[PDB]
Amino acid sequence: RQWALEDFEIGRPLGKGKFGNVYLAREKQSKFILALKVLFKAQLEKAGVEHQLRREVEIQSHLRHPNILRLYGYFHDATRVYLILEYAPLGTVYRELQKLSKFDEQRTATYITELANALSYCHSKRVIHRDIKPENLLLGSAGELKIADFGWSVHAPSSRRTGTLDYLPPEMIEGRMHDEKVDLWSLGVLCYEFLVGKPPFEANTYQETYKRISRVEFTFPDFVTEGARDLISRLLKHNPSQRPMLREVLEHPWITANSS
Numbered sequence: 001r002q003w004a005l006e007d008f009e010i011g012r013p014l015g016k017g018k019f020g021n022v023y024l025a026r027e028k029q030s031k032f033i034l035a036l037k038v039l040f041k042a043q044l045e046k047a048g049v050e051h052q053l054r055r056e057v058e059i060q061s062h063l064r065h066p067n068i069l070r071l072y073g074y075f076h077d078a079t080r081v082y083l084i085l086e087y088a089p090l091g092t093v094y095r096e097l098q099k100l101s102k103f104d105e106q107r108t109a110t111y112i113t114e115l116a117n118a119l120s121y122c123h124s125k126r127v128i129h130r131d132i133k134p135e136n137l138l139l140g141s142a143g144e145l146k147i148a149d150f151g152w153s154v155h156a157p158s159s160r161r162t163g164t165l166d167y168l169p170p171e172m173i174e175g176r177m178h179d180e181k182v183d184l185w186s187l188g189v190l191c192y193e194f195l196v197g198k199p200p201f202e203a204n205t206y207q208e209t210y211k212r213i214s215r216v217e218f219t220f221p222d223f224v225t226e227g228a229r230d231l232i233s234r235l236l237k238h239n240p241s242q243r244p245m246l247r248e249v250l251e252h253p254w255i256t257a258n259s260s
């Protein structure tokens with residue numbers, strides 16, 4: 001509907017982005033509360049990621065799922081690009097993890113189910129998210145998980161190169177061809193991080209994390225249950241073909257026993 005910045009009242013920042021900031025905003029006519037993801041043209045140009053910004057917009061604007069953050073539209077002016085997003089009022093899963101330290105098995109299994117459903121819908125459109133991480137997982141008014149930040153989203157298969165490597169699978173880390181299986185690896189990383197409080201390949205340096213991912217070198221603390229170990233171990237397979245389908249994740253006995 002060719003919006004312009006004059007149509008919105010701007011509130012506090014909601015979060016910092018790589019190419020700008022996200023602000024709380026209210027559309028003047030309807031009083032609709034939303035989030036405005038503001039990006040600087042000069043920064044996007046310098047990075048040469050314009051084309052990828054259009055992909056974020058095109059991919060996310062066509063997705064309709066209760067566990068996927070909505071993108072209502074976008075517009076731009078002389079210096080900025082504005083993405084009109086659904087406001088997630090309970091913030092990030094990242095912040096929830098920082099304050100709780102770790103999630104219990106029931107909260108974890110529920111989040112994994114919500115993610116697996118959203119990803120099943122994405123993959124059915126051959127959409128690869130590729131940036132599944134707690135800061136990109138938002139919470140709706142009922143505490144339901146919403147996949148956000150389609151910034152690095154692509155259509156499968158892809159041989160396209162892109163923060164930390166913590167959530168990236170070996171094939172992406174090595175600049176090789178990849179498909180929807182990249183999001184299955186990220187799901188395994190998230191399951192571990194939710195239960196343990198940190199991702200399994202976390203390290204001080206990018207170099208050390210790269211080596212850990214390449215080797216699939218990780219251990220579980222003693223408190224991690226057999227069922228949780230089984231699902232994570234199945235997801236974190238160096239070989240993308242060996243990673244289970246999302247149908248298998250949703251039907252996993254540990255998921256069905258602790259969700260939702």
Ligand SMILES: Cc1c(C(=O)NS(=O)(=O)C2CC2)cc(-c2ccc(Cl)c(Oc3ccccn3)c2)c2cc[nH]c12
Binds near residue numbers: 040045054075076081
């Ligand atoms: C320098 C510049 C422009 C720019 O000034 N164009 S223009 O004013 O000449 C216009 C007639 C085309 C546009 C964009 C740009 C890129 C992606 C998206 Cl998604 C974008 O939002 C929109 C918004 C509405 C329609 C289309 N896209 C804008 C970028 C990115 C980095 N530098 C840019």
Ligand SMILES: Nc1ncnc2c1ncn2[C@@H]1O[C@H](COP(=O)(O)OP(=O)(O)O)[C@@H](O)[C@H]1O
Binds near residue numbers: 016020022037086092
């Ligand atoms: N719709 C939203 N509602 C609430 N907070 C949001 C929303 N979108 C983004 N944020 C906050 O802003 C941060 C940056 O947004 P994001 O889309 O992930 O940008 P980037 O691509 O730069 O990582 C998020 O991690 C979150 O803290």
Ligand SMILES: O=C(O)[C@@H]1CCCC[C@H]1C(=O)O
Binds near residue numbers: 018019039050152
């Ligand atoms: O929305 C963005 O800030 C960016 C658009 C260009 C590709 C990378 C992307 C991101 O970091 O999510």
Ligand SMILES: [Mg+2]
Binds near residue numbers: 135
């Ligand atoms: Mg983000």
Ligand SMILES: [Mg+2]
Binds near residue numbers: 131151152
């Ligand atoms: Mg992003």
